[PDB]
């Protein structure tokens, strides 16, 4: 009388699903003998072997550093100047960026058209960019053709010629570039956050500067800026790939001679008008935008602060989450799990920025207008949890992730050269991989708690928000969420 499971399509479906479940119930050890999802430390000392980065200091004060690997076939040669938009004078804000744009063009013999023709004829690339307090002009080239690239860099950095018609054309180009940046909302958010956090300080002003100032260059400001800030002690030449240190040193010595001898040293320049964090907020409500983008930030650590590594670990254990992330609801960080499980945000990203004598540390969320209060609760809860109740497995996972991220990012010739120059400018030395790993391994739960108490516990925050933000909690909400009354 009772029907068999063959009939009753629901009985058939139940049988099929039960068969599949009983299929996947028995694991296998030969595919599980190495997994160990619980994180643990390891000593990669047997692996961290890289060629020595030879450093030389020409007596005019010029540092040249190379990491040669003569088995390769390409190379990257560049100049890393310790100057940027921070070192302006409140009326020449856009000078650094505009000088970049101009210095691409022409010299007493380069003739921008035929200069770029030469660059593209040898097959290489030539790029540049300016940060708040760092400037880079680098070129990627091949073996036996490095010297031409080095000569071109020296020529453009020393004997550049600025002509009025090209200056007008670049004024037009930079006004267009300013008009296209508001589409990129993340950069706008971070510019506003910098302005409202380091207000009344040289770090507050943007990189591009104001259009009213870009319209009044006249090339006298350009020449004055280059002669006052591109001095010999503040520059570093870096090379990787198939290069020879002695050849590079000889070429730099023979070429970089018409420099700007001066005394404006960035250390003394930062001694005056330092960077001062001021807790505040700016919130630009629109309600015509589909997504609300905001960022909260605490005061960070300087480049040389020994707690900078701890802050890097902490921003690794608040790792970024994305709506197309592979992990999804399963991730190491508690903040990513909270965001993904309850789907309260389109994407979150924790950032750690380091400057001289200051820095930043935040979470950069981007969500929908209705989940903002829950998202803010999640962010503040996880940060103050880092203050109070950090866990050993989380710390170990964060340290492993940080080591892996750094060593995987250093990949190629241009990344190696960029690492050499940036580290030489920030610390005065290039930190070896073994020492970097030792410093990271010196971070444990007690270290994380101490650093978070130093930087997060009951400290002012700076908020920058844009879009439909009616539901975003006010300043007092975040300010009170920076501590727990339970402990």
């Amino acid at each position: 009388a009772p029907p068999p499971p063959t009939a009753m399509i629901y009985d058939r479906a139940a049988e099929a699903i039960k068969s599949k479940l009983r299929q996947l119930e028995n694991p296998d050890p030969r595919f599980l003998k190495h997994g160990n999802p619980r994180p643990a430390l390891s000593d990669h000392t047997r692996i961290l072997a890289a060629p020595e980065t030879r450093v030389t200091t020409l007596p005019n004060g010029l540092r040249v550093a190379t990491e040669s690997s003569l088995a390769a076939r390409t190379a990257t040669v560049g100049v890393w100047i310790d100057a940027g938009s921070r070192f302006e004078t409140e009326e020449t804000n856009g000078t650094a960026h505009f000088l970049e744009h101009m210095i691409f063009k022409g010299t007493e013999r380069r003739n921008a058209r035929e200069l770029e023709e030469e660059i593209e004829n040898m097959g290489g690339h030539l790029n540049a960019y300016t940060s708040r307090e760092q400037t880079t002009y680098y070129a990627k080239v091949t073996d036996s053709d490095v010297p031409q690239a080095l000569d071109i860099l020296a020529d453009i950095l020393q004997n550049s010629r600025f002509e009025e018609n090209r200056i007008s054309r670049e004024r037009d180009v930079i006004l267009r570039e300013m008009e296209e940046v508001e589409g990129q909302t993340e950069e706008v958010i971070f510019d506003h956050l910098h302005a409202t956090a380091f207000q009344y300080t040289p770090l507050g002003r943007t990189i591009l500067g104001p259009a009213q100032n870009i319209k009044t260059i006249t090339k006298a400001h350009l020449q004055s800026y280059i002669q006052t800030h591109y001095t010999a002690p503040r520059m570093v030449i870096a090379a990787s790939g198939a290069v020879k240190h002695e050849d590079i040193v000889e070429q730099v010595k023979k070429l970089f001679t018409k420099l700007s001898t001066d005394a404006t040293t960035t250390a003394q320049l930062v001694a005056k008008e330092p960077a001062i964090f001021t807790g505040s907020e700016v919130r630009m409500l629109d309600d015509d935008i589909p997504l609300a983008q905001f960022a909260v930030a605490f005061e960070g650590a300087s480049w040389k602060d020994p707690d900078s590594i701890a802050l890097m670990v902490m921003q690794a254990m608040l790792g970024s989450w994305n709506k197309t992330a592979g992990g999804g609801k399963h991730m190491g960080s508690e903040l990513a799990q909270r965001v993904g499980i309850n789907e309260v945000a389109e994407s979150i990203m924790a950032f750690n920025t380091n400057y001289k004598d200051t820095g930043l540390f935040g979470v950069y969320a981007v969500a929908k207008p209705d989940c903002l209060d829950d998202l803010s609760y999640a962010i503040m809860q996880e940060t103050t949890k880092l203050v109070y109740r950090v866990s050993e497995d989380d710390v170990t996972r964060a340290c492993n992730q940080l080591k892996s991220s750094l060593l995987l990012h250093i990949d190629g010739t241009s990344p190696v050269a960029e690492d050499i120059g940036r580290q030489l400018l920030t610390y005065g030395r290039r930190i070896p991989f073994a020492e970097l790993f030792a410093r990271i391994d010196a971070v444990d739960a007690s270290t994380i708690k101490r650093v978070a108490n130093r930087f997060i516990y009951d400290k002012d925050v700076a908020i920058a928000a844009m879009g439909p933000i009616q539901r975003l909690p006010d300043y007092n909400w975040f300010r009170r969420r920076t501590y727990w009354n339970r402990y």
């Binding site: 409202t196 002003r205 104001p210």
Partner: protein, 74 residues
């Protein structure tokens, strides 16, 4: 012309001006006080604790015994 509220969106400045009619702003370099405030709040808080204890004890001791009963205790 520029609607003057997108000008502020497109032009972030490091010199931000607040109202300063009800509250004078500290000069930028000065630190956040954050301690004077908590100590003022603490003084008021233990004033409040004193008040609450007074009220509770008044009610309970009123519900307690009485002088005529204590006199008749013999």
């Amino acid at each position: 012309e520029i609607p003057a509220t997108v000008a502020a969106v497109k032009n972030p400045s490091s010199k931000i001006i607040y109202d300063e009619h009800n509250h004078e702003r500290f000069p930028p370099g000065d630190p956040s006080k954050r301690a004077f405030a908590y100590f003022v709040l603490t003084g008021g808080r233990f004033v409040y604790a004193s008040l609450i204890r007074l009220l509770v004890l008044k009610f309970v001791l009123s519900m307690s015994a009485s002088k005529d009963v204590l006199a008749l205790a013999s």
